[model samples]
Target: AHSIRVDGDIILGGLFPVHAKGERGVPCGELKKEKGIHRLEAMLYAIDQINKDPDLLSNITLGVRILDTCSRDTYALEQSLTFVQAKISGVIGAAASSVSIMVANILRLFKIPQISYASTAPELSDNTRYDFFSRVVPPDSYQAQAMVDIVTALGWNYVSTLASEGNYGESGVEAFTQISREIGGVSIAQSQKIPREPRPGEFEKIIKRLLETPNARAVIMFANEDDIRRILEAAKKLQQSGHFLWIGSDSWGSKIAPVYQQEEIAEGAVTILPKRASIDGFDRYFRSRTLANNRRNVWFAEFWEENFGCKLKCTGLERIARDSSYEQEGKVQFVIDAVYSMAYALHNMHKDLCPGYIGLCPRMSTIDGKELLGYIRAVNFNGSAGTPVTFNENGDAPGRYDIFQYQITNKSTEYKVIGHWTNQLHLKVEDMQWAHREHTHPASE
Candidate 1:
């Protein structure tokens, strides 16, 4: 509402080349063909939507500067940070967990807010105090707890763990350990971290260790798509003995599950992830756009047609093109909601600092900084994803997570929702002692 100059930079960074490595020492053709091109396309849709919303940004114009961490390299992340730091008021990316961490540290030093859309690493919220970084997805803590709950419900008391040996893996393990202890179970087996480019026989060792553990009824894996698929393939090889239930973290929540072609192994596998369900408005928008354009694979094509209509060819790639209208809708909604929330927060901040009230020019003091951030933290926006979005004290949203179980029917992979857990369902750190003392479960005879 306040006629303030929105001269700040708003950088939107994300992964570049969005594909996994191939087995032949070349980029995986299938994955490269189906790269997450929708991420950028959806982000641009959100930015434009925010700019058009009168209630969100009356006088401010939201500008987007895109940066890509070409690979999972720290150097690339730092370079992206340097690029973003030059002019942006805030940042929105580096989608991978490792890259997000690197960019987060850099943004912390500058006191510039960085909101990642999908980095759910638990440690991200542990010691960060700048109050400027936030994420739309709930951390691994929620996913881990949900996983334990799922395992307990299935009467699994002993579990084995396989992790990627990185920040993501460590954080997932830490959260799972906490949940396991609380739920009256123990991690009976653990495997060494798999290298990014794992060797041929590496998984056999991990599988052997898991099989050797006594009463190892469940196996929780924390890895990206390739690693997870490799582990699953190993599990299928061990399925001759028919041992171990498989559970996963958010790393497996991608649209490429069909490409794995390991239905036998993927069946009965469960994973916990930030909710990716599509909502009403998103479907309507996507359908209207697709129908109006008379386009097949409208989601990917529309990004080019609607936004970059005159810029390029925008031909739909084979594998990377969105396979389902629903998946495309979900992706669009996620990005749109993130942009809408930020715009709404900034708009509110402008209102709070009008000319007559607090005066347009405020001092750049710690108190003022806290005040600005507090306002942002308190924002509760209703997003298109069917979840009411808000940030906790740590600038993280705990209101995201759903438990999905995979099923293979007639050699095809499909997932279903068996449980749902949101960050709101968690016991806060300060209240943990009281929860532990007050709650009791009946002992088994």
Candidate 2:
């Protein structure tokens, strides 16, 4: 009766909103948590768009199932996997790098295509199984190289590195160290494996050791906001002046800039990240939607605001909440589009090779996952966020990492766009080495 039919359901699993539960214990500003909500909203938007498109599915429908691995815990991940496996087609999630690794291992067993929207840990790329995973963001290898370039460009020769005691921190440090050594710069001191929450004066001790290192010109920080805040506080206490520069990774460039906008402590500090479009478009869209409902602009506040009606005080907090929602929704859009893309691929394949034999339909094996992957990989289709989507051989999207620098001018926070990197520069597996070289030594070394 149908030209193409699904043998089993497709399920997309999401592993995000990676925050500790309960309002009392949650970190004040967690990017993963915000992105989780955004992912859900984006999925809804994509489903709506796809369902309305005549070219996709003709008579079929796409469905999404979500999973939340609150943190990098394997238990939550397993639980999420169990939840998604019961009723979905493919999987998409685990925004945290460590959890993504866990999810990758799980998907490898089932040959399910797991598309990660945010997890950028370099180790994920090492898994050779195509069925297991892909991502929209460039890995730590690329970002760490970008960080090294920023450090050396400012004439910094010696640096002390500090990272969180997890996969996110360790991978960044590993990549940074390798690139720094190649650039002839020295890592005078390094600190990882810090306690999750340090006791009073613990950070002071760490900072003193780093500062006391002879001729330390910069501190490369590879931790999230909580750890970075501790370091900043210690730096303020020590009255560290212009002699010390603090450099950070992409995590430091979250849209909530006001959290770290204190002039004295944040001045002269540099962080590298993808250049996100200004929130003007988001503001406009949110405002229009809210206004149509006869609601105030605050109605478009945080996801919690939309759901729980909670009020936020700062614009940065609002922006953080909005960006999280935006990114989450963007991820959902990717999943929805992916489902439609799969259907289109299947439909076309069936049209060209329908032998018309009863009980002889195309099996999963007959459908080329690689060819379908290639078609999706070559896609430049517009996403829900209106951003262009494409992927490289390793299944990472090129041009996803746009370099950004955080600065404070006249007591206002600002993010400046510097450059962008794509498949052209970091094309092959080994080309990553050359890309690092270019990042470190922009001019002849």
Candidate 3:
């Protein structure tokens, strides 16, 4: 548990999974060394750039102390307390909603705003309930509709369901089922709940029902990494691997389990992942940075050694170090956007209060947290992630996701952007790999 300090500088608190920790690793999950680390660095990267530009922040330095909260409410609550004593203007996130819920509850008591980078549970969308909670990522309510639309569009009425037994899992299933039934064209063959951490007989119970469900051509999963892995492993043992096309919610959207790493045993699995776009120079910046040239990235050495399967001091790492960049991490674009959201919100707050002021900013110390929260809702701008970043009445941004189809067998190509789903835009799923399932699919945006 690292300290969460806040002194003056209009402190923006950040919470991220620097490394995998906590109960069941709900949000970023255990395999986030490849994901969460980059998101953390990207947040810092955006903050540093914002600080360098004095005009963006009205000459006020936006400082952040991000605790490595590895998806646990306990750690999130503890880390958030570190900011209570100081004047914290806003908070960045706890990557998963389960933890983010706890963090938001604590911070809202002080009227401090908490913005999530990747959390998408539908329950978090209620601004009336969680006034202080807002997020750059779209809530799962929209995402759940997109999942159901996928099922209905594909003409697969009979589908099995799996979800974690937590807020994210339970709410996601509820949203998906509610929307699916509202569409009046789909049926849930079986809906099974898995504990955040699977216990003795839970795995068998789920797998048995999954295999027994008649005409279960599609399976929509909304669980975390560990739970998903358990189901996948059981499916493999039961020889039910190639029988069904798996649909995924945003919770487990971008993840590919180690079991599916060799090839897609869970082949032709499609998911609605938070839409990620290329940030100008971000990819190059990540690749070019090294221990020699970039010292801010303290985790690079550890990430390099662990990911590349070699010691940092070894000759293998020297080649990696000397080389420009490795494959860039995914989902960092939104993290950058979220950082910019808080920064821009603060900037707007400054402009509102300290009119035409320059040099030493006065609002840094005097800006109220409640005022900052209002400014956050009004902070509209072109984000670094190539989108107009703004929040709705629900405190959720008009969000979108790229329909990613994961290949089951071929190791060469792992992910493909078949189409996209958004609130206002067309759900172009014509490009999605429908696996071996035979059906002339209907289109629904």
Candidate 4:
């Protein structure tokens, strides 16, 4: 019942983390911005952009059937089944690698190729297993290498690690551990896993394990947004604000959701984010949207209510704040690129299947999953980030990481990019401002 539909000759399936996990027996919860709405809209914007282009898919329209994942694997798997029934040409979605894994398994059986915007779990790289799955972002193995490099560069020999207890978390931290051991010098003093849904005392228990090794003050976290926020709250409650140096994964990259009101606690945290760029007119397109105009998105009403803190028809409430601009999601380009990848693949397929034809011909009209999969694998072009987008044999994109340090002052937070990693790591160590000594990087001990 909860879907956004638009009819076309070919339809693309979209899975987004629109609503957070619901509480009190409900099915879904709050409206997540960066991971949810931004990515969803980016896919739509890309679709619209392709439809408007006369050269690409001429005389053909790309329609969509978008579904809300609600940030759950089981629920996401159930929703993905609908795509199998609908026989969508392709799918662009699923922020969480865990959810993507679940959805990919089902889609692979149907030979429907899936491209992910944010799912970075290393396990997804297995071509034989997830043959129909591909992604715009690199896997966690590269991110693990980057984290180890950052830890070694900072001379943090002893550190603790925490994972969110799933494919994305477990695989990443395992890779980090392996890389740190292989590089030598750096040692992980303790390793722990946060429960999928932390119970009453789960976070504090994890914090206690972290404190077990007092000298291992540097902690690397491979966790989702909600778990990270809860862990930060636990750290604050335990009065361990200035006790540890935190290193984060792309899941929390430059996002305010994890550190919204707890910026002080997250000060000096260094995080690794996939390199991204803003779309040219996405802001205007997004800003121009309202509930009345963009009724396809079923969750917009709830998003407006939660974001603006006003009821739709309240007596003294009016939604007229036009100047309030939202920050673009870091993965917006990737989402746009993912959509274009499918479009280009379909375009190339159309070119080959119906040579000299402007639109879908007799053979192109009937979409073939196996045949489209072949075209998608060979797709190579400049993506929305202005970088060459090509998939490896394993269906994974090239690795590009941006290193950011959370610089907080007087309650103001800035995600300052201290460096980047492509074929190698590049950082300005002296430019970093650690929370502890302000200038000196904090020692694990």
Candidate 5:
């Protein structure tokens, strides 16, 4: 059971790999102090805003207990049990797809509705094993097919698949591989696995193979921050001499390089990122995320120190929050979507089940997990992402990720959304920009 004191009408649990468990496929580098926690911060932003939101959840307060899965499978299981013990109403994240799978299996027994922002494994495509599973992002089965379409249609038939160790990574490449076989062209020249934490000579070997594979004209990589940075760092040492164009998966493509400042190596790298939606007035609150703002938030201090590049001193927190301005988040909309998915679920649950009670939910008509989840599955509203947020019959959203090519122009890197996919099945890219160079011709040419 969670040792933290419980408060509020209902509790919402958030799972993110805020810490790096090096052995369990979490990044060893400063990744914990980096992008992963942004997902968590976004959740809090959503919760705090919702509590203050009159239209969304004015009377009913949504409490949150955020947990760090450390990008491990077992850690997810252990942490989720606390949410279960606390009897949380709904949950968000466990960003890593594999960890989400483990947590979903465990949370299913308790019937806690789990919505993920980044978990895109095809394994969890539909809620087969876990009835409680759902996500804002489309499944890898969709992205994998899109990647194959990009590579093969471009006549980059000979390719190599570099996948991270976990399910999120491996499953993506596996989907691409399985679909490639059924498609007209495209072949996996070589398949290599890189650990998120990496052991001695781990990246060295992967980089060597990536560069040496003459047939690997396009390299499809599904990696975390650690693996993505290491591969690019190693590739950059070769001074952009590596000829193979890089293809990043939805997992790490967005935040991985944009934060690393090592965008040169990631230049011309193409990948898919989960769709996200913006929240109004979030910037003002995101900056002021201090102990002054959230006195009881356990993570606010640590997150502030890391983002502010200072100690956890809340002396000038109010002013500091107002002054907060950083580069745009890689996937803020996805976080907002995840939060809204849960909020709308709760909103509709209360609206439908306990009708005619606006100021406060009626205590007479009790709500259970299954009933709440049924409402979530039925929730439909224009979300912060500017799209109708609803779950499919399989408890999945027909979401789409924009296809992007990371480019460095005028000394800045961003995932340029050159194209997008919809219905979670098809992709639409008119022109894919080159990371550098005027244009590279196909090998067959």
Candidate 6:
């Protein structure tokens, strides 16, 4: 297993799905650029910033024992075990909800506080069960509502639904189903679940089910990127372009991989992702870093080679130009704040436990996870995005969603912001461009 370790006074654990699963054989495969590498870099940047600051943790420095989950729940569980033997103070990851749940179950037994930057399943909101679990992002219950609101607002009364199997998808679809009833108007014509290791012809059958439903061109989706890509490909294989409109959850938010080369098949798809803002310094810090300077991150060499598609010292890397205006990942702010939250909690603990001490006191060196959890629960601060961050009783953050639509033109295809949601849906109907159709929103049938 490839891992990164940086020594410090106190060790923190990080579980990132830096690599995607390699089907059934290998535990890991290709690197996830936007979702994985960028987020991991953001975590390192935050730790560096916190350590540089004199007041954050006083003289104490923060270190990390980070591992790759490979985007699998069982693999995530195995990687999480590494944290226990290392005796980490706290943990900061496991991106997907299913992976987070599996890790949380293990971490809770040992009372290690786990804070997630991405996982948004509603099941994680149960404080009694996941007592040590907390997250910087809000739960899928809010995402479900956002999807329901989009459907109700567009008058997509009769639509089919598809979700990837597991806590994230199944719980998300269930919430959407339940909420659609509470609000009234929207009707589910067909519901299907995409298998984890989908068998051959599975997506074809799922897409066929959508076609069999009457008056259901609008299809609601709560699946991850891998499943989503397969479903879209299957639809394309069946020559079903422009036949159905897609409504998606946060997992599909403006992501290119799902629709990478299938723009025609994914035109006019609407998705709601957690509203995110760029951190002021992350982009510059990430762009300036090189393998020589960033030796602590073991994966940087692999990431650099893959991102630029250039081997190190290949003809002196002629004109190895990197884009200065590189955009940081949407979730970078959340990752930074998760690290800050842990730091702030530790800072508070240091002050209370060892008043006026310059360095680690007796209690600070041997920090109690149960005691530190109290400080984490009460942590409140302005995040890197300049927004107030706080947790509810359920250890879930407040919900805000940004609405996006895949707008295709003769020359370009991009995700256009249609609107956003706080407590109510705020949409600009004029901004929506349905594929090969009139300006007005399409009916569910």
Model number with the top lDDT = 4
Clash pairs detected, candidate 3: 263-408, 264-408, 264-409, 287-325
Predicted model with the maximum TM-score: 4
Give the per-residue lDDT of model 4 (tens digit) for 294-387. Answer: 7877877777776666697543333433534368888899899999999999999998889987888998868888888888889989987688
Q: Is candidate 1 or candidate 2 better by lDDT?
A: 1
Q: Cα RMSD to native, each candidate?
A: 9.4, 9.1, 4.8, 2.8, 3.9, 2.9
Model 2 bad stretches (over 4 Å): 1-10, 18-33, 83-86, 129-131, 183-188, 196-202, 233-243, 257-264, 275-388, 419-445
Worst 10 residues of 4 by lDDT: 314-323
Candidate 6 clashes between residue pairs 3 or more apart in a chain or in different chains: 215-445
Per-residue lDDT of candidate 6, residues 77-172 (tens digit): 887888776469899987899999999998988889989998999999887779899899999888888888888889889888898888988888
Worst 10 residues of 3 by lDDT: 436-445
lDDT of 3 at 183: 68
**lDDT against the true structure, each candidate:** 0.57, 0.53, 0.71, 0.86, 0.70, 0.85
Off by over 4 Å in 6: 310-326, 437-445
lDDT of 6 at 53: 93
TM-scores of the candidates are: 0.74, 0.70, 0.87, 0.94, 0.87, 0.93
lDDT of 1 by residue, 294-335 (tens): 332223343344333333454443222243323452244556
Q: How close is candidate 3 to the true structure, as a TM-score?
A: 0.87
| Comparing 3 and 4 on lDDT, the stronger one | 4
